[PDB]
């Protein structure tokens, strides 16, 4: 619904409004699409309401990495670009006893 307070409060443009019929004759016979007529001094323009959107808040995620964590102390992080071309990595050890 059209807030007529926004019309009653905003500065308008001065126009010599000239139409041939009377104003009320154009009004009550409904030449237009929406009217707003008060015969007194309507105080409905004087009270204004807000919604007060204070702040929009995105999230900042903590940029936790592998080597930033202390759990990498038990790890030995190597980067090897041809990793998908291997099957398995075996390790051999030879001990003779004391």
């Amino acid at each position: 619904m059209e807030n007529w307070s926004a019309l009653e409060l905003l500065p308008k443009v001065g126009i010599p409004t000239d139409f041939l019929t009377h104003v009320k004759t154009s009004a009550g016979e409904e030449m237009f699409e929406a009217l707003r007529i008060y015969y007194g001094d309507d105080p409905e323009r004087y009270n204004i309401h807000f919604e007060a959107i204070f702040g929009t808040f995105c999230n900042r995620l903590e940029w936790v990495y592998f080597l930033t964590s202390g759990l990498a102390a038990a790890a030995h992080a190597i980067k090897f670009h041809d990793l998908n071309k291997l099957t398995t990595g075996k390790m051999l050890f030879h001990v003779q006893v004391p």
Partner: protein, 300 residues
């Protein structure tokens, strides 16, 4: 004391405060006459009950207190009870025209027929229903019509009273048609019928013997159109009473001025006792009416 603060458990959006800000100087009923009040007992929504009795709503509303709606500011209402005597302004939404000169009464609202059922306030299940402000002749007309509905309809099957009330519930008052929703009989309505029957029995008893035959005298003297209708009504009542010829009256013997004064003063007392069933006291006396018939200035 005077300014009564109400609240809301629910938040109002911009739409709710927008439709509240066009309700300034509307009269709302308050049952308590207290200061820090709550919104569920505000209005008639706690008291409205379909299939319970219009006359119950009428009696509780005429027992309820009235106040004026001014200056919402967000979760606050600021009801102000009108003082007795000083000029105030009112804004009615009841689709009934007004007049600069007549008086007002406050009635529980009827359905107009378009059936909007939106009085521009709803909080969840809770809604706001506004009491209709009605000009005095329509008010006493609907009061007397519900009284005839309660008085006539006893010990009758549904078809004859249905044929009565399809044309009795409708009232065309100044190019506006209204119908009464809940005409259901009440024990309170039974005590109204009790006062009605006792009052009409008393005005049957202590009426003068010349007034019991006065319309026969005016019938034999003069013939006018309303007199023709009155003779039709009275002679039909006579032939429903007696098929014999109603005799002409002669010189009345018991002529005594103090007797007529005393018995007709008691008669006027009893007619006051009968009329105060339907004659409601006023609530607003119009100083001015707005040309769009939305608002008015009334002195009370």
């Amino acid at each position: 004391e005077a300014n009564i603060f109400c609240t809301f458990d629910h938040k109002l959006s911009i739409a709710d405060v927008g439709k509240l800000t066009k309700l300034v100087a509307a009269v709302v009923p308050i049952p308590q006459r207290l200061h820090l009040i709550k919104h569920y007992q505000l209005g008639l929504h706690q008291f409205v009950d379909h299939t319970r009795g219009y006359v119950r709503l009428r009696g509780l509303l005429r027992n309820m207190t009235l106040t004026l709606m001014r200056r919402v500011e967000g979760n606050q209402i600021l009801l102000h009870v009108p003082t007795h005597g000083l000029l105030y302004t009112v804004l009615n939404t009841g689709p009934v025209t007004w007049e600069k000169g007549d008086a007002l009464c406050v009635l529980p609202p009827l359905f107009h027929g378009p059936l909007a059922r939106e009085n521009l306030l709803t909080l969840g299940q809770w809604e706001l229903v506004l009491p209709w402000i009605v000009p005095m002749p329509l008010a006493l007309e609907i009061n007397q019509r519900l009284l005839i509905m309660g008085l006539f309809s006893l010990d009758r099957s549904y078809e004859e009273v249905k044929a009565a009330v399809q044309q009795l519930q409708t009232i065309t008052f100044r190019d506006a048609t209204f119908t009464i929703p809940d005409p259901v009989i009440d024990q309170h309505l039974l005590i109204d019928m009790k006062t009605a029957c006792l009052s009409m029995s008393m005005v049957a008893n202590l009426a003068s013997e010349l007034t019991m035959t006065y319309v026969r005298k005016l019938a034999l003297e003069d013939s006018s159109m309303l007199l023709v209708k009155c003779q039709e009504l009275l002679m039909r009542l006579d032939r429903e009473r007696s098929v014999g010829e109603p005799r002409t009256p002669a010189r009345p013997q018991h002529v005594s001025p103090d007797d007529e004064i005393a018995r007709l003063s008691a008669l006027f007392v009893m007619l006051r006792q009968l009329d105060d069933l339907i004659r409601e006291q006023v609530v607003f006396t119009v100083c001015d009416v707005s040309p769009d018939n939305k608002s008015a200035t009334c002195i009370f």
